[PDB]
């Protein structure tokens, strides 16, 4: 991620991972994409916050 430290420092300063998820009518595309590198126990998965 470009300017990594800035995100770290801006997220650190906030001091909260509070998170609400919204809805984006992603028309005609496959959500919940998956990769074998991001294992979540048995099955493969992906980052929890990204689609």
Binding site for other proteins (CB under 8 A): 3, 5-7, 9-10
Name the residue nearer to other proteins (CB basis): 11 or 38.
11
Is the CB of 1 or the CB of 27 nearer to other proteins?
1
Smaller CB separation from other proteins, 2 or 28:
2
Nearest 10 degrees: Cα torsion 7, 34, 31, 15: -20
| Least gap, CB of 49 to other proteins (angstroms) | 19
Q: Phi and psi for 34 in degrees, rounded to 5?
A: -135, 145
Please answer whether residues 36 and 44 qualify as being in contact, where contact means their C-beta atoms are separated by less than 8 angstroms.
yes
């Amino acid at each position: 991620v470009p300017d990594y430290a800035s995100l770290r420092s801006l997220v650190a300063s906030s001091g909260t991972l509070e998170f609400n998820n919204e809805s984006f009518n992603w028309a005609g595309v496959t959500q919940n994409g998956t990769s074998s590198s991001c294992r979540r126990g048995s099955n493969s998965s992906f980052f929890s916050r990204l689609n």
